[PDB]
A paper describes a structure:
AcrAB-TolC is the major multidrug resistance efflux pump in Escherichia coli, where AcrB is the efflux transporter residing in the inner membrane of the bacterium, playing an important role in capturing and expelling a range of structurally diverse substrates. AcrB is homotrimeric with the three monomers suggested to cycle between three conformational states known as loose/access, tight/binding, and open/extrusion during substrate export. Crystallographic studies of AcrB have revealed that large substrates e.g. erythromycin bind the proximal pocket in the access/loose monomer (access binding pocket) while smaller substrates e.g., doxorubicin and minocycline bind the distal pocket in the binding/tight monomer (deep binding pocket).The proximal and distal sites are separated by a short “gate” loop (herein defined to consist of residues 615FGFAGR620) that has been suggested to regulate the progress of substrates through the export pathway. During efflux, large substrates such as erythromycin are proposed to undergo a sequential export process, first binding the proximal pocket, then passing the gate loop to the distal pocket, and subsequently being extruded out of the cell via TolC.
The first, AcrB(AAA), contains three mutations (F615A-F617A-R620A) chosen to remove bulky side chains from the gate loop. Wild type AcrB and both gate loop variants were crystallised in a novel crystal form at pH 6.5. Crystals of AcrB belong to space group P21 with two AcrB trimers (6 molecules) per asymmetric unit. The wild type AcrB gate loop is clearly identifiable in the new P21 crystal form and adopts a similar conformation to that observed in previous asymmetric AcrB crystal structures. Both gate loop variants also show well-resolved electron densities for the substituted residues. Overall the backbone atom positions for the AcrB(AAA) variant are similar to the wild type gate loop, while the AcrB(ΔLoop) structure reveals the gate loop deletion to be remarkably well tolerated. There are no obvious structural distortions elsewhere in the structure for either gate loop variant. These structures confirm that the gate loop substitutions do not perturb the overall fold of AcrB, its trimeric state, or its functional asymmetry. Strains expressing gate loop variants were both found to be highly susceptible to erythromycin, when compared to those expressing the wild type (MICs: wild type AcrB 500μM (or 367 μg/mL), AcrB(AAA) 125μM (92 μg/mL), AcrB(ΔLoop) 62.5μM (46 μg/mL), AcrB-negative control 31.25μM (23 μg/mL)). In summary, we have presented two AcrB variants in which the gate loop is disrupted, either by reducing bulky side chains or by removing it entirely. These variants express and fold similarly to the wild type AcrB, exhibit the same oligomeric state and trimer asymmetry, but are significantly impaired in their ability to confer erythromycin tolerance.
Numbering used by the authors:
A (entry chain B): 2 to 1047
B (entry chain A): 101 to 250
C (entry chain A): 301 to 350
D (entry chain C): 51 to 100
E (entry chain C): 851 to 900
Write the structure that this text describes.
């Protein structure tokens, strides 16, 4: 402290060391958009081709839900049993659990369940994965020539690119969009009755002829003596071409005219699945979703991947061009450009405020060295704690440009003051001044970490968001007061100019700031004033409570956000067709939507990625989804040219004009979180009941909540409602007669209409599948059932209509389970200005109006909200107590802390003022902001209260005289700090361009807060101080003429 | 945890060399104190159900969640969950000239779900308009329809 | 704490139980750990007072 | 039974396709033998948790 | 060798190529630390250069 005054070089060395650590930690520090925030979930997925909802729910789903146990830290189980044969069991774990352990343990209980599965599922694959819906990129591959189909392209994807990109530095998970080439063999029902054959015979034919064989070796061990030759018996090799599959022999006819497979079926290299069709502006396309590697450079993973893709550009086939429908990268690059712009802008402002106020170039340079240094270092402390440059942490730093700016200003000011007041040369001046502010500053460090640390401890995904802020800011601050104590006092004692005693430079110069008088008169005005306002304090205690009450009202009205919705350069629109619809209808709708975007939005849109089959609801021809890419924002000027009005005019288009519901929206900021003002209700069956009764209970609760539009709003299920299905009752009696095997009946019906993955081959070097399914025109409408024949042991064919009863009924196409038992998921939010928690209470009281065997429970968003929500009071209680205790220590008082803690309202009010006059919302940013403001306001209170006491004691001055003196000397720096600040933050508040959502959320609260805080504080702080001090002691007193200095 | 995974990683090298009755009965790899943490009991005060009635409610309503709770290693049930218990008569089998094997292949063939497919499925024919779920053979839900097994 | 989690899970299952099904508690190392260490607390506080 | 090209095209490189994104991996090297044996070695950045 | 045939080092010679490619930066950082360290202890810029 006093130490580094006489050691400017040791100070420089600590500076330089921290700077080098900064630049070093800055070069090699990750960049991601946001940090890891979702409470880890592993996904088990199994595809059971052909299976209906109940078949996967009962054969795979429940057998795995029953063998999942003994895995550490299980929060809940959620299960999709989809009628496209797919099962998705999503195990979401307690937050911050080892993803690695969760995945492996889950999978090791799964491999224990593996033999208890059907063999179709066992061979199709059950996969355990770590769930992130946040793909760094979706890279598109298209074909302009018109040459290639979806699967053609897809195959090229899988066999030329998919894994060369998967090399590039920064790439973790690689995923392909579409389906790879399989041996697609399409049976003909006529040409199968012709030569008297069923699927089973096709099947064993294909297994037998297309395989490897456990061979042997010449000259093997043990040998015979004198041996000399050793080589490998090459046995049966699998079939390379489609032709060679045509050649496979099903049966020989009696006269020798033989039957090769080609005759009974159409044969082709085809897709392994044809559920989803991917169009890129109508153009044939497949895709690849690349993930940023588990903690690496987003922007350099992007630069490397795009550079790598182009090395493959000279070896890409005809008319094959690459495209980028979804790109986190330019939005993050631009986020960062604006954080660097802001911090350096704020800093420049500080130079203008500091010069055009102290007019000493060497005084002006000091903070210019002071916070860059705190900057670099702050980076280094976060580097050490394992963090990255994402949005939350960088705005975590901007959010505290002010405490840093303040820290420097406080000191330089106080020194310049000591010289202008006392005439001391600079060295002795900096010791007098550090001697003055040192203890206070350690105090500010203890009150600032007393407010900023309780906000590091929240639980669930909210706590994560906060932890980033807590540590960024506590570290900027910690290193800030450290710099404040080591270097800058050395920089004041070492490059600061001596001021002639009582200089003040009134007039003394023509071409620059007659201002000094203009400042001076006024600062006397300020104190001329203040004593009068002390002279009858009464009114202000009224005014104060007025304001305090107001602060509350204005506050209770502020709406309760989570984060601002950002125009990401990218938004999407999804399509839901009526029940049971076909690939063709949905595909029509996607085509229309695309035309609308590319035309009636020709100034804006750049790309549509129409995807048929994948929709928001779940899987099925039924659903459709479109990724809509916009041009770069320097080509989208106006208000009606940006995502807000674009999405609004797109749903405008598609609502009023269709037979199907097609909605458009922009993605949320953090790609997986709560809708803030709502919930996610799962209605559960705990007693022994079937789907009928549970859905009935669901409808009952659906109506019971439509009866409260005053609390609850748009209470809906998130799934597919019962569609009609087609039951084929096999009368085993009839087929028990005809000499057919029930096996062959089931499995021919199967391999016909659902299909059969049967065997494996080797295409051009890469192993791929062999599928056998009926051709198109012989398996579409229930009539085609007839065209299909099963052969008995006695040689006689049988039509299906000979033993197949058939009807229509309903069935559920999507069977959900919650924690092992049948459930139906109810989404919902609360009516406008009603609490989410209230809606939750009314929900529990409504679902309590349901039959026994119907129970309820909470998940995800409303899960973390029902456990962690009583923390907000307790942590700021710890905060209040810890700060009060800290000040009590810094002074030597159980009462004086009150005149400074009382300043806190004075700052909150303007931010609320500001929220409302800017129509913004109480989101996270506003709140970290709240604190920041409270922070400076309190710091200033602390320095005023200190100087007051310091006079009162260590000069003998009296209460009023000394509070006057105090406030007097602290007027100029508050004003300097506040100007540089309000002027640094200013650009945030009025700025559009990517991440303006954030910048505005921040800026508003701060600027308003700063305004009402300084302009209030400079009149209330002496009153707090003066009033509170009159309840202590009982005498000795008001007071002066005292005494030692000893 | 690491040990569990390594031991179980050698168990995956023994898994195919075990019988299919064992593999389907389930092999379990666990971490667990050799002592009982607690014994939770359920009864019925009236007698309104026998032992196995209850035991079934225990194994089919509760046990799956006690055994998922984080921190629970081994759960051991005193008793058993309901199965379709079918008690052959050796005489009544010698009569119609039948062995257990016929019971087995019968029950295997008659009682199963079936991969059926979709009307108007993927890939479809042009001009299509119907898409819905073919339901085939379903599992035998009740106790009677088990007698009717042919 | 495993015991607290289990009391919670069982309390979730309480309302969809059939006619007259009561849980009963034959064996628990748990209440002893609490009451034993609690008697060590009663002692700390008393001793302070002495 | 399979020969080297058969294991390297059916088993080996179907495994190297999934070894992406694993943390603190220095290099990968894989042997494809014609006695049915396939052997992959992942060498990690030094001091990585084994 | 022909266009498209390349080289790399692994195991021992990889670790040796790391030792040498690292050797310069190690002598720059250690020299710089001694210098700051001395500039600090002996409050000077002259003691360090000399
Ligand atoms: C950063 C810049 C801040 C912008 C400030 C712009 C002006 C708005 C606030 C000015 C506050 C001064 O308001 C102050 O109020 C008190 C009333 O209690 C007056 O006080 C008056 O009444 C008291 C006793 O009744 C007497 O001392 C009397 O001599 C008189 O001073 C002061 O004369 C007035 O100076």
């Amino acid at each position: 402290p006093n130490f580094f005054i006489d050691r400017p070089i040791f100070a420089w060395v600590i500076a330089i060391i921290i700077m080098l650590a900064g630049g070093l930690a800055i070069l090699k520090l990750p960049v991601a958009q946001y940090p890891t925030i979702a409470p880890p979930a592993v996904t088990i997925s199994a595809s059971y081709p052909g299976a209906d909802a109940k078949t996967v729910q009962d054969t795979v789903t429940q057998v795995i839900e029953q063998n999942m146990n003994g895995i550490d830290n299980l929060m809940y189980m959620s299960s999709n049993s989809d009628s496209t044969g797919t099962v998705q069991i999503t195990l979401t774990f307690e937050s911050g659990t080892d993803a690695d352990i969760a995945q492996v343990q889950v999978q090791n209980k799964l491999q224990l369940a593996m033999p208890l599965l059907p063999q179709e599922v066992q061979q199709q694959g059950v996969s355990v994965e770590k769930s992130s819906s946040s793909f760094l990129m979706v890279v598109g591959v298209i074909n302009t020539d018109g040459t290639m189909t979806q699967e053609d392209i897809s195959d090229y994807v899988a066999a030329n690119m998919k894994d060369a990109i998967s090399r590039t530095s920064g790439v973790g998970d690689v995923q392909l969009f579409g389906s790879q080439y399989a041996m697609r063999i399409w049976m003909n029902p006529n040409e199968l009755n012709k030569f008297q054959l069923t699927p089973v015979d096709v099947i064993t034919a294909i297994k037998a002829q297309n395989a490897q064989v456990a061979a042997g070796q010449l000259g093997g061990t043990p040998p015979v003596k004198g041996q000399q030759l050793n080589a490998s018996i090459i046995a049966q090799t699998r079939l390379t071409s489609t032709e060679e599959f045509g050649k496979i022999l099903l049966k020989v006819n009696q006269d020798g005219s033989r039957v090769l497979l080609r005759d009974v079926a159409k044969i082709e290299l085809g897709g392994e699945n044809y559920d989803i069709i991917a169009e890129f502006n109508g153009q044939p396309a497949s895709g690849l979703g690349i993930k940023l590697a588990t903690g690496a450079n987003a922007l350099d993973t992007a630069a490397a991947i795009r550079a790598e893709l182009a090395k493959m550009e000279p070896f890409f086939p005809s008319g094959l061009k690459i495209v980028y429908p979804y790109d986190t990268t330019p939005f993050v690059k631009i986020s960062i450009h604006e954080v660097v712009k802001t911090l350096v802008e704020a800093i420049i402002l500080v130079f203008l405020v500091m010069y055009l106020f102290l007019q000493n170039f060497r005084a002006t340079l000091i903070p210019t060295i002071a916070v860059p240094v705190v900057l670099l270092g702050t980076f280094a402390v976060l580097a050490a704690f394992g963090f990255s440059i994402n949005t939350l942490t960088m705005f975590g730093m901007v959010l505290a440009i002010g405490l840093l700016v303040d820290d420097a200003i406080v000191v330089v000011e106080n020194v310049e003051r000591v010289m202008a007041e006392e005439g001391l040369p600079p060295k002795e001046a900096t010791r007098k001044s550090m001697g003055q502010i040192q203890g206070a500053l350690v105090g500010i460090a203890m009150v600032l970490s007393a407010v900023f640390v309780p906000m590091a401890f929240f639980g669930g995904s909210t706590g994560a968001i906060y932890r980033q802020f807590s540590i960024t800011i506590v570290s900027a601050m910690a290193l800030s007061v450290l710099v404040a104590l080591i270097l800058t006092p050395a920089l004041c004692a070492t490059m600061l100019k001596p001021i002639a005693k009582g200089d003040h430079g009134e007039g003394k110069k023509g071409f620059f700031g007659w201002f000094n008088r203009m400042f001076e008169k006024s600062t006397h005005h300020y104190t001329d004033s203040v004593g009068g306002i002390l002279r009858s304090t009464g009114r202000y205690l009224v005014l104060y409570l007025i304001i305090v009450v107001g602060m509350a009202y204005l506050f209770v009205r502020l709406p309760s956000s989570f984060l601002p919705d950002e125009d990401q350069g990218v938004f999407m629109t999804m399509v839901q067709l009526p029940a049971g619809a076909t690939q063709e209808r949905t595909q029509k709708v996607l085509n229309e939507v695309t035309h609308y975007y590319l035309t009636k939005e020709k100034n804006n849109v750049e790309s549509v990625f129409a995807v048929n089959g994948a929709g928001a609801a779940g899987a099925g021809q039924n659903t459709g989804i479109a990724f809509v890419s916009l041009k770069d924002w320097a080509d989208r000027p106006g208000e009606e040219n940006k995502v807000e009005a674009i999405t609004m005019r797109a749903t405008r288009a598609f609502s009023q004009i269709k037979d199907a519901m097609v909605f458009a929206f922009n993605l949320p900021a953090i790609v997986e979180l709560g809708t803030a003002t709502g919930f996610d209700f799962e209605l559960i069956d705990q007693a022994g009941l079937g789907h009928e009764k549970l859905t009935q209970a669901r409808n009952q609760l659906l109506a019971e909540a439509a009866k409260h539009p005053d609390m609850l709003t748009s209470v809906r299920p998130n799934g597919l409602e019962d569609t009609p299905q087609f039951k084929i009752d096999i009368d085993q009696e009839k087929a028990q007669a005809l000499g057919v095997s029930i096996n062959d009946i089931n499995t021919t019906l199967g391999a016909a209409w659902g299909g059969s993955y049967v065997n494996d081959f080797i295409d051009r070097g890469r192993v791929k599948k062999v599928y056998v399914m009926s051709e198109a025109k012989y398996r579409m409408l229930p009539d085609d059932i007839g065209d299909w024949y099963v052969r008995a042991a006695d040689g006689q064919m049988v039509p299906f209509s000979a033993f197949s009863s058939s009807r229509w009924e309903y069935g559920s196409p999507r069977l959900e389970r919650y924690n092992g038992l049948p459930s139906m998921e109810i989404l919902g939010q609360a009516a406008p200005g009603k609490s989410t928690g209230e809606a939750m209470e009314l929900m529990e009281q409504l679902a309590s109006k349901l039959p026994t065997g119907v129970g309820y429970d909470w998940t995800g968003m409303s899960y973390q909200e029902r456990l962690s929500g009583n923390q907000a009071p307790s942590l700021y209680a710890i905060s209040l107590i810890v700060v009060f205790l800290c000040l009590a220590a810094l002074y030597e008082s159980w009462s004086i802390p009150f005149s400074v803690m009382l300043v806190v309202p004075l700052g909150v009010i303007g931010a609320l003022l500001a929220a409302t006059f800017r129509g913004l919302t109480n989101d996270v940013y506003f709140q970290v902001g709240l604190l920041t403001t409270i922070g400076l306001s309190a710091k200033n209170a602390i320095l005023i209260v200190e100087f007051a006491k310091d006079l009162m004691d260590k000069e003998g001055k009296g209460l009023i005289e000394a509070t006057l003196d105090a406030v007097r000397m602290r007027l100029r720096p508050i004003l300097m700090t506040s100007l540089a600040f309000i002027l640094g933050v200013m650009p945030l508040v009025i700025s559009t361009g990517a991440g303006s959502g954030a910048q505005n959320a921040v800026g508003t609260g701060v600027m308003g807060g700063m305004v009402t805080a300084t302009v209030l504080a400079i009149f209330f702080v002496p009153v707090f101080f003066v009033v509170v001090r009159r309840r202590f002691s009982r005498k000795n007193e008001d007071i002066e003429h005292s005494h030692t200095v000893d």
